[PDB]
């Protein structure tokens, strides 16, 4: 009921200032039920979006520079990938390495460490999801996730 | 039975109790919501001293 | 206490920022002169944040030490992070 | 239990001399968390010199200024010549390694179990990665960074 | 020209580890002119590829036949002569890793360029002579055509 | 850059439903037509009730709600009547509304079924569908000896966006690509799924081979009418309403462009 | 490995020696430590009171930190160490084991108004009356009761108008 | 308490089918065959007729307030 | 208590414009059309018709909130073209398509009732 | 050299940002941090 208390709440208790908790030095809020099941399905390797679908999704990016990205597949038909659109969602130029929950433990030893057959081993570079399926481990409330590194 | 219209409630300078001049209790009494001990502790952790004083002094019983 | 040697942090704390912004916003709302230029801002909080970014808030923070002494810092003397 | 804990610690606060004190002004901690750092900014990291063996520690952290061709692969020509010729620089790097070895023993007595997971303010590997990508560092070409500049 | 690499590959295996994704398939191929291994992720739904097929692969830095950089932005209303006209399957990705057999003292005899086409991953590994055009964090095109 | 040239093929036309196929149109056009069938095809329905006497076991709002959902023949009258918003009259007039009266009293020992046949209108063209000259009459309320219901309703022009009682459809079946050739669905086990009535596949084949160059064409419709409008009148009124929405939008667009 | 014997080999690697350890159902730390072939350096107990009686206040500080950490982390959870450290310093900063109860929290010199907020409101205020105790209004509870700005967060400092800068 | 007018799902009129439904049931139809005779082909309208409890018949066992 | 009248989804409030055009500054030759008291019914068809124009580089729409009753359609065209002109042509093409569809449905009904 | 200088500045700024602020009610914060997880761990 005063400008002083309003400024206090706006500078101390606002939700974005509350993303990381001092209790366990990690995010306290993360991506949750539908958005998490769907981002897992969306960042799978075989998710291909058509031009109209991509424009529909870009309508819902607030932080979009208005430039349609070059599709990952140009021929025989232009197709964007879910990782290619989440790369637009990912802010700044953050860099992050995670592993999808189904990541086999004997894959980081053998070959294909940097080209994962299962599309596990999340790698975000310069704010582009170079590879990997996003999940709780990448967008949840754990330490070192994309939301934490973004904050 | 739990419909929202029987639960929604708001207050801005309504009636107060007789003994301690604080907001009444309940929707039916047009009462205010309790800013309890745990809310006090939360706002102490926040460090919001003026908001804490507003809730526990100025919005209750100056 | 010797103002030549102030031991407290040269940064403005989050609480100092909060209270300074609230105080200056109330002062602006009570028709105090504004220290910065204004395009179309009419909200006292926006004007106070513009003054803080410009380092033109005429407030001194008196930080008390546990021993009882105090240190006076101008809002322009502190490092504003957020 | 929650109420009891709160009423026991409610007035403990970080003061402007950076000590943590209670209402009586008694000192509970000379610095918050023994390090004077807030818990939101710290994060998990790894101490790289804790677990490795003496041979591995030597091989990974001792700057080898004798292998001319390896330096030629890592550094530019003027840096290679300065590193190989100058002895002041070589002594600086030698003392750098000695200081890291002393740090290794300090870590070994701090963490008597070989657990390199630590919680520290700045994620140095992530910052190094950020610098690599911001300045377009080519990992395959020799660098123009003088190791003496790194030490200083 | 703007071509970083060109060769003819022969599909020697498809999904050795089993089908991981429905519309995407991993091809393990080998060329003949350069003896380069290739792991490639392709959308087999729109561009099916059978075992034993033979195709020409062209990693390029640009699609315009004349040396001219790309802006990385989608411009379907572009009437310039694009080399994608001469190919069937075209993808657009970025190099995210370059490995090699280099030592602390010796340079690399064999390189291994890794590219990601919006998540569809490729590894082109072989002699370092054929992979000087590849630089990490650099955008390239696939330009792949099937031949009989 | 220009319009489609859709074609139409009506495969069934009864008094109860119309089953047709639109080819060579976009899926958005087909679904907007489907949505307008439900939500922007006006009809006449009771939207004002005045209970003068109700001794029945259902309270007043129950009877009013129940009267609102009785379909009224709206075929040629709905285009002529105005919205009460647009009428320059008082609360009501014959240009924007239709008056109904209901007056029933159970004096006899058997239960009296107050049905839609008891809704007497001033307009002969706008009457309850069941009362039109088989299907029985919609039951408004059952009355016991000594119970009585006397009310006065007014029916208005509206569409399904405002209330489902102004929805003329009793189901709009809409389908496309009956054989999953565009793969807009992905069956985990395509053999487990029954075949569409519009499918053209031999029984061994579960779904059509995937069409990479395909687009949704050939949309199948089954527009069932609640009774107020004929099904073909629902479709024609839907097309006209969508076209007038677009025309009004273009008029306002032209004013905004020229004002800049 | 948390109970194995972690040594440093001559090559400099951490090696976990798999050795016999005993777990007792009672505690005599005083006696068990002073037994032949018993390690008097790593042998410990979970009874913090005995640790305080045998080893002292800093030993019980460390042991109490260990036991609270064990309770918190047993379900895989994690809490920043500064919170455990602050709780453990609160219980040990006065040289004795200060329980988080009325018997430990209302027995320190915190002021009668802070104490009445927690427990034993009437007994505390009556004791303060009988002994003429004075509350200096240093804590947050006392200021909150009197409707004054708590010396907490935004209240831990004062603001002054800068006359020379209003120009 | 009384048969709804429309089907909640599609909006098909079911109010005029309760009495016919009961007459078919006393005519030794099965509930499924009765629902087929009335033209309720979607399982939503079959739900409407098949799950209806005519409570109004019990409310009409009480004398009204006025004679 | 808080239920908006059902007509507020269809009816314009006094002084509220049916459509508003705002230049998009992020990219050139782009506009935002904020259309009040419409929903997916017109948004989807206008978007899909705009996608048929090769001079349209972007065509999308969104209902920013289902409880609110407006849509926003973003249209970007090639520099020689205009988003307002594209939007106008899309509406004209939809109107012509619906007129043709209506006439052909009338013909089909006449054939079906006759034989 | 440019990358290393930027890295040094970044480390310095982030470290100074990690320093605890005078006025933080670390005691109430610690009580909450230790009591909130207590509500999930098992009674038996
Ligand atoms: Zn009228
Ligand atoms: Zn139904």
C-alpha pair distances (Å), F95 with each of A97, F47, F48, F152: 70, 15, 16, 18
Q: Does D133 touch chain E (CB under 8 A)?
A: yes
> Which residues of E lie inside 8 Å of F (Cβ-Cβ)?
22, 45-46
Residues contacting G116, CB < 8 A, separation 6+: G124, G125
Report how far residue H20's alpha carbon sits from residue H33's, in angstroms, rounded to the nearest whole number: 12
Among A72, A67, A84, A85, residue whose Cα is nearest residue E92: A72
Alpha helices in chain F (DSSP H): 27-39, 60-68, 231-259
Report how far residue F103's alpha carbon sits from residue E78's, in angstroms, rounded to the nearest whole number: 74
Report how far residue F203's alpha carbon sits from residue F192's, in angstroms, rounded to the nearest whole number: 12
Tokens linked to I9: 């989804």
Residue A25 maps to a domain: no
Residue F201 per-residue DSSP state: -
Which sequence spans correspond to the domains of chain E? 5-148
Q: Does B62 touch chain C (CB under 8 A)?
A: no
C-alpha pair distances (Å), B32 with each of A2, B42, B43, E26, J41: 19, 19, 19, 64, 34
C-alpha pair distances (Å), C21 with each of A12, E130, F22, F145: 12, 62, 64, 77
Terminal CA-CA length for chain I:
56
Contact D25 C65 (CB under 8 A): no
Q: Which residues of D touch B38 (CB under 8 A)?
A: 2
Please name the residue that has the structure tokens 């790593």.
G42
Contact F69, F121 (CB under 8 A): no
Tokens linked to G66: 């260990």
Contact E120, E141 (CB under 8 A): no
Report how far residue I41's alpha carbon sits from residue I72's, in angstroms, rounded to the nearest whole number: 13
Q: Which residues of G touch D51 (CB under 8 A)?
A: 13-14
Tokens linked to D24: 């009586």
Contact E102, E35 (CB under 8 A): no
Distance I110 CA to ligand 2 centre (A): 30
Tokens linked to A103: 């990541």
Distance G159 CA to ligand 2 centre (A): 70
> What is A6-46 written as a DSSP string?
HHHHHHHT-GGGGSEETTTTEES----HHHHHHHHHHTSTT
Indicate which ligand has the atom closest to the C-alpha of F83. 1
Contact G51, G92 (CB under 8 A): no
β F112-115/F139-143 pair status: antiparallel
Closest Cα in chain I, distance from residue B9 (Å): 11
Tokens linked to G57: 């206040």
Report how far residue D11's alpha carbon sits from residue D24's, in angstroms, rounded to the nearest whole number: 9
Q: Does I78 touch chain E (CB under 8 A)?
A: yes
Subunits in contact with chain C (3 or more CB pairs closer than 8 Å): A, B, D, G, J
Beta strands in chain I (DSSP E): 19-23, 30-36, 56-62, 70-77
A 10 A CB-CB count for F157 gives 25
Report whether H11 belongs to an annotated binding site. no
Which sequence spans correspond to the domains of chain C? 1-82
> What is the Cα G50 distance to its own chain's centre?
16
Contact E10, E49 (CB under 8 A): no
Q: Which residues of G touch A12 (CB under 8 A)?
A: 153-154
Report whether F93 belongs to an annotated binding site. yes
> Which residues of B lie inside 8 Å of A (Cβ-Cβ)?
46-51, 54, 58-59
> What is the Cα F225 distance to its own chain's centre?
6
Subunits in contact with chain J (3 or more CB pairs closer than 8 Å): A, B, C, D, G
Sign of CA dihedral G101, G104, G107, G112: negative
Resolution (A): 3.0
Alpha helices in A44-145 (DSSP H): 51-58, 82-89, 136-139
Please name the residue that has the structure tokens 């959902």.
F69
Residue A118 maps to a domain: yes
Report how far residue E61's alpha carbon sits from residue A69's, in angstroms, rounded to the nearest whole number: 16
C-alpha pair distances (Å), A80 with each of A44, A100, D62, G101, I27: 13, 22, 48, 62, 20
The SS3 call for residue F13 is: strand
Contact J15 D14 (CB under 8 A): no
Question: Which of J24, J34, J40 has its CB closest to that of G83?
Answer: J34
The rounded radius of gyration (Å) of the Cα atoms in chain C is 14
Residues contacting G164, CB < 8 A, separation 6+: none
Among D8, A22, C21, C49, residue whose Cα is nearest residue B46: A22
Please name the residue that has the structure tokens 């001033």.
F122
> Which residues of A lie inside 8 Å of I (Cβ-Cβ)?
51-52, 55-56, 58-60, 64-68
Residue G6 bridge partners (DSSP): G16
Subunits in contact with chain B (3 or more CB pairs closer than 8 Å): A, C, D, G, I, J
Chain A meets chain H (3+ C-beta pairs below 8 A) = no
Beta strands in D98-152 (DSSP E): 117-120
Tokens linked to A100: 């999808």
Question: What's A128's domain CATH number?
Answer: 1.10.274.100
Tokens linked to G167: 């120009």
Instruction: Indicate which technique resolved this structure.
Output: cryo-EM
Report how far residue A43's alpha carbon sits from residue A116's, in angstroms, rounded to the nearest whole number: 14
By C-alpha distance, the chain E residue nearest F183 is: E45
Residues contacting B35, CB < 8 A, separation 6+: B55, B56, B59, B60
Note the residue count of chain C: 82
The backbone torsions φ and ψ at residue A82, rounded to the nearest 5 degrees and listed phi first, read: -60, -40
Report how far residue D2's alpha carbon sits from residue J38's, in angstroms, rounded to the nearest whole number: 8
By C-alpha distance, the chain C residue nearest G165 is: C58
> What is the Cα E127 distance to its own chain's centre?
15
Tokens linked to D7: 């009423």
By C-alpha distance, the chain J residue nearest B49 is: J23
The rounded radius of gyration (Å) of the Cα atoms in chain H is 14
By C-alpha distance, the chain C residue nearest D22 is: C66
* Tally of domains within chain A: 1
Residues contacting F19, CB < 8 A, separation 6+: F10, F11, F12, F13, F220, F221, F222, F223
A 10 A CB-CB count for G94 gives 14
By C-alpha distance, the chain I residue nearest E75 is: I57
* Packing angle of the helix pair I40-51, F27-39 (nearest 10 deg): 160
Q: Which residues of B touch I2 (CB under 8 A)?
A: 8
Report how far residue A30's alpha carbon sits from residue A141's, in angstroms, rounded to the nearest whole number: 5
Residues contacting D144, CB < 8 A, separation 6+: D75, D76, D79, J1
């Amino acid at each position: 009921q005063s400008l002083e208390t309003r400024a206090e709440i706006q500078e101390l208790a606002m939700v974005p200032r509350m993303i990381v908790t001092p209790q366990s030095n990690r995010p306290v809020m993360g991506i949750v039920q539908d958005t998490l099941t769907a981002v897992r399905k969306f960042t799978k390797r075989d998710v291909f979006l058509e031009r109209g679908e991509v424009m529909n999704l870009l309508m819902f990016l607030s932080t979009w520079d208005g430039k349609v990205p070059q599709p990952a597949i140009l021929k025989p038909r232009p197709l964007w990938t879910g990782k290619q659109i989440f790369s637009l969602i990912i802010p700044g130029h953050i860099n992050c390495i995670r592993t999808h929950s189904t990541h086999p433990d004997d894959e980081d030893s053998g070959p294909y460490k940097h080209i994962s057959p299962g599309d596990t081993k999340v790698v975000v570079e310069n704010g582009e999801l170079i590879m990997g399926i996003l999940c709780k481990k990448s967008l949840g409330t754990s330490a070192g996730s994309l939301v934490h590194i973004s904050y | 039975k739990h419909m929202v219209d029987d639960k929604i409630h708001s207050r801005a300078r309504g009636p107060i109790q007789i003994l301690n001049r604080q907001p009444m209790e309940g929707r039916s009494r047009d009462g205010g919501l309790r800013f309890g001990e745990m809310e006090r502790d939360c706002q102490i952790a926040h460090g919001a001293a003026q908001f804490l004083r507003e809730r526990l002094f100025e919005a209750s019983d100056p | 206490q010797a103002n030549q040697k102030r031991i407290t942090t040269p940064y403005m704390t989050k609480y100092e920022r909060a209270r300074v912004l609230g105080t200056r916003a109330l002062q602006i709302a009570m028709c105090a002169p504004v220290m910065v230029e204004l395009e179309g801002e009419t909200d006292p909080l926006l004007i106070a944040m513009k003054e803080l970014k410009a380092r033109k808030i005429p407030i001194i923070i008196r930080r008390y030490l546990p021993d009882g002494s105090y240190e006076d810092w101008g809002v322009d003397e502190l490092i504003i992070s957020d | 239990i929650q109420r009891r804990l709160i009423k026991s610690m409610e007035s403990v606060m970080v003061k402007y001399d950076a000590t943590v004190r209670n209402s009586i002004n008694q000192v509970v901690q000379l610095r918050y968390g023994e390090d004077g750092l807030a818990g939101e900014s710290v994060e998990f990291q790894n101490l790289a010199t804790l677990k490795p063996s003496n041979k591995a520690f030597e091989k990974k952290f001792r700057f080898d200024y004798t292998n001319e061709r390896a330096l030629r692969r890592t550094l530019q020509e003027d840096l290679v010549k300065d590193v190989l010729s100058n002895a002041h620089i070589q002594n600086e790097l030698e003392r750098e390694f000695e200081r890291m070895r002393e740090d290794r023993e300090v870590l070994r007595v701090i963490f008597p179990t070989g657990d390199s997971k630590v919680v520290l303010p700045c994620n140095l590997l992530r910052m190094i990665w950020n610098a690599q990508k911001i300045f377009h560092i080519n990992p395959r070409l020799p660098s123009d960074l003088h190791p003496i500049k790194v030490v200083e | 020209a703007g071509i970083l690499f060109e060769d003819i590959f022969d599909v020697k295996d498809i999904d050795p580890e089993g089908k991981k994704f429905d519309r995407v398939s991993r091809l393990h191929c080998e060329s003949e002119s350069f003896k380069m291994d290739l792991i490639l992720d392709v959308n087999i739904q729109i561009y099916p590829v059978d075992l034993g097929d033979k195709f020409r692969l062209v990693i390029a830095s640009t699609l315009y036949e004349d040396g001219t950089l790309d802006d990385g932005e989608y411009n379907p209303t572009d009437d310039r002569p694009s080399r994608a006209d001469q190919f069937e399957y075209v993808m657009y990705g970025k190099v995210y890793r370059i490995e090699g057999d280099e030592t602390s003292t010796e340079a690399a005899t064999r390189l291994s360029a890794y590219v990601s086409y919006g998540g569809l991953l490729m590894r082109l590994q072989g002699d370092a002579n054929n992979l000087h055009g590849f630089e990490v964090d650099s955008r390239v095109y696939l330009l792949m055509k099937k031949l009989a | 850059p220009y319009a489609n040239q859709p074609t139409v093929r009506i495969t069934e036309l009864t008094d109860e439903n119309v089953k047709f196929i639109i080819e060579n149109t976009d899926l958005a056009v087909a679904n907007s037509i489907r949505r307008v069938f439900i939500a922007e095809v006006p009809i006449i329905a009771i939207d004002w009730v005045q209970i003068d006497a109700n001794s029945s076991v259902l309270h007043d709002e129950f009877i009013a709600h129940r009267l609102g959902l009785i379909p009224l023949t709206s075929d040629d009258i709905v285009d002529k009547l105005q919205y009460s918003r647009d009428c320059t009259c008082e609360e009501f007039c014959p240009e924007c509304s239709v008056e109904f009266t209901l007056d029933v009293r159970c004096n006899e020992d058997q239960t009296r079924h107050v049905t839609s046949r008891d809704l007497i209108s001033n307009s002969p063209r706008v009457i309850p569908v069941t009362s039109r000259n088989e299907q029985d009459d919609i039951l408004i309320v059952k009355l016991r000896k000594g119970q009585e219901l006397r009310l006065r309703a007014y029916a208005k022009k509206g569409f399904g966006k405002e209330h489902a009682k102004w929805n003329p459809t009793a189901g709009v079946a809409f389908e496309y690509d009956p054989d999953n050739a565009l793969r807009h669905t992905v069956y985990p086990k395509p053999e487990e799924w029954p075949k569409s009535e519009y499918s053209e596949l031999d029984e061994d084949e579960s779904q059509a081979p995937y069409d990479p160059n395909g687009k949704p064409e050939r949309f199948y419709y089954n527009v069932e009418s609640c009774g107020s409008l004929r099904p073909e009148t629902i479709v024609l009124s839907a097309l006209s309403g969508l076209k007038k929405k677009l025309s009004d939008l273009q008029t306002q667009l032209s004013h905004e462009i020229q004002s800049d | 490995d948390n109970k194995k014997k972690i040594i440093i080999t001559e090559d400099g690697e951490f090696k976990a020696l798999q050795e016999w350890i005993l777990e007792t159902d009672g505690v005599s730390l005083m006696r068990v430590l002073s037994e032949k072939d018993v390690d008097p350096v790593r042998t410990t107990s979970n009874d913090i009171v005995e640790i305080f009686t045998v080893l002292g206040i800093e030993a019980v500080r460390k042991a109490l930190e260990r036991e609270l950490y064990h309770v918190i982390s047993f379900d895989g959870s994690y809490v920043n160490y500064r919170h455990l450290a602050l709780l453990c310093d609160t219980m040990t900063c006065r040289g004795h084991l200060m329980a988080i109860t009325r018997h430990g929290v209302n027995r320190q010199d915190t002021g009668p108004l802070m104490k009445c907020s927690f427990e034993e409101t009437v007994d505390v205020l009556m004791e303060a009356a009988a002994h003429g105790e004075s509350d200096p209004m240093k804590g947050v509870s006392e200021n909150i009761m009197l409707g004054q700005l708590a010396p907490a967060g935004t209240g831990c400092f004062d603001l002054l108008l800068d006359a020379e800068k209003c120009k | 308490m009384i048969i709804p007018v429309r089907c909640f799902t599609c909006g098909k009129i079911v109010g005029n089918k309760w009495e016919a439904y009961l007459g078919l049931l006393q005519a030794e139809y099965t509930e499924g065959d009765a629902l087929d005779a009335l033209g309720l082909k979607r399982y939503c309208c079959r739900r409407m007729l098949l799950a209806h409890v005519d409570l109004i018949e019990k409310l009409l066992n009480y004398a009204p307030l006025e004679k | 208590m808080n239920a908006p009248p059902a007509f507020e989804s269809f009816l314009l409030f006094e002084g509220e414009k049916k459509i508003t055009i705002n230049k998009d500054t992020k990219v050139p030759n782009a506009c935002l059309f904020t259309i009040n008291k419409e929903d997916h019914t017109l948004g989807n068809i206008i978007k899909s018709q705009l996608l048929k124009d090769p001079q349209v580089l972007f065509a999308g729409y969104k209902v920013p909130h289902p409880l609110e009753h407006k849509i926003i359609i973003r249209v970007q065209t090639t520099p020689d073209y205009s988003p307002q002109e594209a939007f106008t042509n899309a509406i004209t093409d939809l109107i012509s398509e619906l007129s043709l569809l209506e006439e052909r449905f009338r013909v089909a009904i006449k054939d079906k009732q006759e034989g | 050299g440019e990358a290393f200088d930027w890295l040094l500045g970044e480390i310095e700024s982030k470290f100074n940002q990690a320093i605890a602020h005078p006025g933080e009610m670390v005691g109430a914060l610690a009580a909450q941090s230790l009591g909130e997880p207590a509500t999930q761990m098992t009674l038996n």
